[PDB]
Design a protein around this ligand. Structure first.
Ligand code: ZN
Ligand code: ZN
Ligand code: ZN
Ligand code: ZN
Lengths: 469, 468, 469, 465
């Protein structure tokens, strides 16, 4: 009580501004706040809106504590502390009736009990009422906690032992230091920010990525740039797409030649046509020939039913052949006939079948001396060497490594949350200085190990990948 | 200002501030800045924008009623200008109306105004980056509200430029909503959808989508204690206590494999491996090599030795669907495993004992299959010790609703979040059906009924088994 | 042992022929037969070799029974039946010891117990150091069953009760007519000659079809024959796909607009670039804008970490927008800016970045009258209506119904069932007389239900689909 | 010679020197080849009969060398074709012969009259536009190679089964031929049964992996630590006591709780696991106990909690320390009185839920900081169960890794047949901060980095060393 601050609330109406000391002020309507709190509780629940108003009262109380300290710096301990309730009476929030006070800034002692008459929160509560079985003066309590804590330096927690919105006779509150309370953990959880919008964004992102994981075979790599070698590889595949040339993918294991062939097929004039990939190592050669070219029924090797070969399955399209060196010699002769005249014969069949099939082979072994050993035909090598396309390893793309890895982090982050919000410059330096035999598979694997292995820290360990053992 | 400066009566001793007949309060601008900051940080920008817009709109309605009750007639322009004069009086903004055209009787309205020293831009200063959209929200709401209450028509302003976006001046234009082209963007702010319900809904969707991951037991037959389901349940639970092999006689598509899984879970060996085997797989020489393995050597064409499926069920349980489709050597080896607890891999001389419970199943009548020599009598009598007949849905008339209800909840979450309706005519049509396919056909028709349902709250009667 | 047996094996050394009665014969080494059986068992199954040798012995026994009948023509029942095993002894295969016999060709009664001394099959078992777990005298048993059956006129079946190759003391066999046996199926299974090469081709085809799921599906039911309505839609789709013009797909639910947009992207110049489809049925408020255009972190919005929008995911590529009418007005404005100026900015983002994204919107509701009442902006409507493409309901393409279902049937023939491709024309005539309110999705669903309701019947039953209530 | 094929019919045997012989019918061989081609094709049966004739020819070459040790250089080679004529296979007419054992030179051309293979071909006919005398050709090649010591290859330049007038064959050393790769490919064993077993195994594993996994981490024995942990979980399984799993990150506590649930008396009842760290606490409270509709907390529709979803069953709670204090009080009420209330609801609901909490942080001092309730800690610490790290189970490590390698070998269908004991020593000598999880990860990376039949390198895992 005892205001004596109306002389400092000077204001100039002509400019549309209100002042108090050096601080700007605003005059808001109470009915608007009533509808505001009504819709707030309707769209946020009660516990969440209570915590939000509590945090806002705490922030307003810290600001008013700074203001009161700027107003009368050398008043007195009690005279400075009373400015809080005096600010409540001045701003029209509540009328304060402190029935008991005990304060000593040096010893840390604190205790108070006060009555809040004509609280604006109980007045708006008459507009939005229902069960109202818990105290409603939330911003008042948060402002009280903030002002008392800023004045004492200790954590002070108030509790409205009685409130008019609960059917009680008078709003009465008690304030003691937090150490002298029984259960403060619930109150401290009331003070947490709990940003629901970020939780909603994370849930929507995880839900979209989890529902899109079906048919998730389009985004891969080979589409980032930033190194001259990749630019050469992409413009070279652009040149190969427009032409009818059979393409040979020279590279190393784990560089992703199959997705490269898929991109070359999509960039070609026959992108809508089927694309069939065949890993020659997966199929034993005795089955390799019959799978690549099919087989017709009959007494000659004839099974019960004719089966179309993979080349006819890719008619008007493209055939990819990984590890083409591992072909049976008769299959190599059939491939040479298909490549030079566009004709094939099913196994056990004498009649010919026309085809129009683009060919993209790939291999890691040095085919030039492989022909010298008799392991591969010379003519088929001559027909396949028309358009070599070298795909560099990451060791040839050292400066390109970081963009991939952070992208990989996102690819794992939504699967497991934004764990490891760091890069560990030592780990990045170790990644720049490594041969990487599995240039993209080993990278994805070690990044998976780094994501799973860094649970009790927000920064990736340098030992999580390339452990010293 | 004649003479509104005297309208702000306040008594400090009473702890109240008054304006006309309306109680009011005076807050700091920095506190409102932190208020808007935490508000936008907790909800979306549009949610907070709608909140502040509705707050300004309610304040404008109340202030229009107050100005109407203060000076009764006077003049039209003075009564309309009392709104912006109230804005200047409360410390919100300074108003500079550069153009006005008002006629309350005819309904004509147009106005262009400048908002100088808006407090909302002072709150925008706490956010170092410029906002991409105008920030004077409660100002716009109070403007539209006061203008609409003063005219009797709905009047809508729009901040064509704002200083919080980097503009030179806060400039607003106000004309009646019917004279606008696109008004829906303003009306979207008035819709108040509870964000917490969307959080619970998204968490429920993600939890339901990740709960469909790798669980083994969730299929059907809940606590619907129908006499037939209860008899079959007590039969399986009494069967689980022993090691006796159990034969599941029933109909195709009833899901005998999960029944065997439940029998294994109710058994004493639930922690031990449970392996199901469909005999529809080709049974030439591969059925024997897969069921009992094969050892490497020159005595058989095996480069690598391969463990059989029965050894994978060691100390556990093996399910055998369509047991009639076994080769006679496989029937003999199964009889040896069932009567002596021993087996030997193909091409292997040494023998190893095993402890494997057996759950066979078949749709064909096994008695007449043993007749004509298609199946050995020994294995038949060893497997028929504890038959468990699974009734068709035709005799399960009372279990049909509970099932479909669970299936509804099971499939409404499947990429659709749709209706829970049943349409009693469709339900009576469903209870009166032979169901040649028991559970598979019912789940298929339930999905087909889900196909032709818009998020209208009712499954169509004609969506199931249409006239043609 | 008989006057006619010795010296009956006429043979000419210089002429290169060996004869026995009227039958040509061959003399092979035992070690060669041992390596023969070794290669046979090492390449095929134990049962495959068992059935081959048993059938070979059966044919030899049938021919030798006819030979013994024509050699001594007068009956002497026991003498001819014992001449059978005596013929076994003459060829050097086995020594026979009939310990019990009971024969009456007229009454059909038969029983015999015999011992096989020095069987060559056990000597071949000696080359396989591991003892067989089952009796090894296969061709002997087949010759026995064949000779006894031809001599009696009834089917006679022997079984080796004990064998020296399985570790037994003596080779002991019992022969009685098949009707007098208890379990005969295990022996009868050896007469079935199922080609192993067909099983190899079938297993390779199944494994390849299951391993081809790693590749993205080549497409869906978009490719059908040149039906005039489908052909008009096809040529319109091709001329629209060549350009960057945004395409609006007006149609009905279940018509499959997404596969249409995917085919448009594959036929476009940006097929290698990402294609992202977005259904607006997902919850809209503030989430539709943040997902379509992203959001940047900062104090201006409740974003802890920035999230890329789906339009940025479609950079240089194509985005599909199903139910575009269900866009928030802010989303419609941002989409209009992206479509008219090629630029967008993330929510809460200060800097603007341009994008190059083709747009394919689609809707079942009529956009006309939707712009009325304000549900959709006129600017975006006129910008999207430049190239409408109406997709007819299946009622106008009933001539396409068989082509679809046939492709669907074989597509479902691989679905864990290896079931049927039949149609039953009455069911097709019942299908043509139906509105199909759900066009293609409902037809695929009823086809799956019919596959569930039909086992070996090849034509799906006419009554299997849509039975009466 | 015919004088050496003496035999005694009384014992049922035919002899030639010290080698036993047998007399087989030709009609049986005709049906044999018919069924062989019907179930194997033509090229496969051709290679089979070729190598079988090769084996018979090598055996007959050893026999002929045993018959006349001092046979002349010409007569010893001629013993082959006369053995062909003696056994009834073919009549031989050598039109040219040239042999020199020392220099390795060889050449011959001969006629095969009345071949039995063309005779059976007359019964089983069709295309047969390629030479049919397969076993004869293999026997000739084997005998000439065994006699010379060099690779000698014959080829039937003409055959009566191809419509030709006479069967004519030529034998030359393999180096002097143009295309020998086809014949050498004909000589390969080609075990089709092994390919069938491999395809069936890969197909069965590929069809069962789509049916979802159950668990794997448990069941690896032969170490004291695992045996103590398993007997502890066995003793804990029969009771209803709430269990606290104290361990380390990545030790696989969830599968341990699932095995304890299956070993318990409520194995048929539902089992629900919840990782508290994955769910933000603001959602943790509403998710563990549900929420009721009303003006309170929002909620357009009531939502069941995970505890009611696990009624009559068991709930696992990883990282129980990260619970909101009101959720901790509700969990203590559920634990000591078996009752719960949905958020925003006043009425109580009975439940019967077994509880297994787990944590990696030191729970004892976490209560001292005010981060966790004391009463709930006393109620959860009733039965602590420590799960050791792999460093305490080093002797068990190789068994795990071999099972791991097998589960990954089948992951790609055909992979390295080695472990490299040096790499095993490196695995035993590592802290493994991520037990079983880091082991699976390093093994997958090492397997992807190796592709031959060679042992996996120690640098494939723990590189840069
Ligand atoms: Zn109160
Ligand atoms: Zn402004
Ligand atoms: Zn025997
Ligand atoms: Zn010939």
């Amino acid at each position: 009580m005892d205001p004596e601050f109306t002389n400092l609330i000077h204001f100039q109406s002509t400019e549309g501004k209100i002042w108090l000391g050096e601080q700007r002020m605003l005059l808001l309507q109470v009915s608007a706040m009533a509808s505001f709190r009504r819709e707030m509780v309707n769209t946020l629940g009660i516990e969440r809106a209570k915590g939000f108003f509590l945090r806002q009262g705490y922030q307003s109380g810290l600001k008013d504590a700074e203001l009161a300290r700027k107003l009368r710096p050398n008043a007195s301990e009690y005279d400075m502390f009373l400015a809080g309730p005096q600010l409540h009476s001045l701003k029209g929030l509540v009328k304060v009736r402190p029935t008991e006070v005990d304060i000593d800034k040096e010893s840390g002692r604190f205790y108070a009990e006060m009555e809040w008459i004509d609280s604006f929160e109980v007045e708006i509560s008459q507009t939005d009422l229902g069960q109202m079985q818990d105290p409603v003066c939330w911003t008042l309590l948060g402002y009280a906690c903030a002002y008392s804590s800023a004045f004492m330096g200790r954590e002070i927690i108030f509790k409205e032992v009685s409130c008019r919105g609960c059917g009680g006779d008078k709003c009465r509150v008690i304030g003691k230091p937090a150490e002298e309370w029984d259960d403060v953990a619930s109150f401290k959880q009331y003070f947490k920010n709990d940003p629901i919008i970020e939780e909603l964004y994370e849930l929507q992102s995880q839900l979209v990525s989890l529902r899109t994981n079906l048919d998730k075979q389009e985004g891969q790599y080979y589409g980032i740039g930033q190194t001259p070698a990749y630019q050469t590889v992409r413009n070279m595949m652009d040149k190969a797409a427009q032409g009818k040339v059979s393409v040979l993918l020279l590279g190393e294991t784990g560089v992703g030649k199959e997705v490269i062939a898929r991109s070359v097929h999509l960039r070609s004039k026959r992108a809508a046509e089927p694309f069939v990939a065949v890993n020659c190592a997966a199929i034993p050669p005795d089955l390799i020939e019959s799978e690549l070219f099919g087989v017709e029924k009959g007494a000659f090797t004839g099974a019960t039913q004719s089966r179309m070969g993979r080349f006819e399955r890719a008619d008007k399209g493209t055939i990819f052949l990984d590890e083409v060196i591992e072909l049976s010699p008769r299959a190599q002769a059939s491939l040479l006939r298909v490549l030079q005249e566009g004709e094939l014969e099913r196994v056990g069949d004498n009649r010919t079948r026309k085809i129009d099939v683009r060919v993209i082979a790939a291999t890691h072994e040095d085919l030039a001396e492989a022909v010298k050993a008799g392991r591969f035909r010379a003519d088929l090598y001559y027909r396949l060497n028309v358009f070599p396309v070298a795909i560099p390893a990451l060791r040839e793309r050292r400066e390109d490594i970081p963009l991939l890895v952070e992208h990989f982090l996102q690819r794992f982050h939504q699967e497991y949350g934004k764990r490891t919000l760091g890069l560990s410059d030592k780990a990045l330096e170790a990644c720049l200085h490594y041969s990487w035999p599995g240039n993209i598979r080993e990278l994805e694997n070690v990044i998976e190990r780094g994501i799973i292995l860094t649970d009790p820290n927000e920064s990736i360990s340098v030992q999580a990948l390339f452990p010293r053992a």
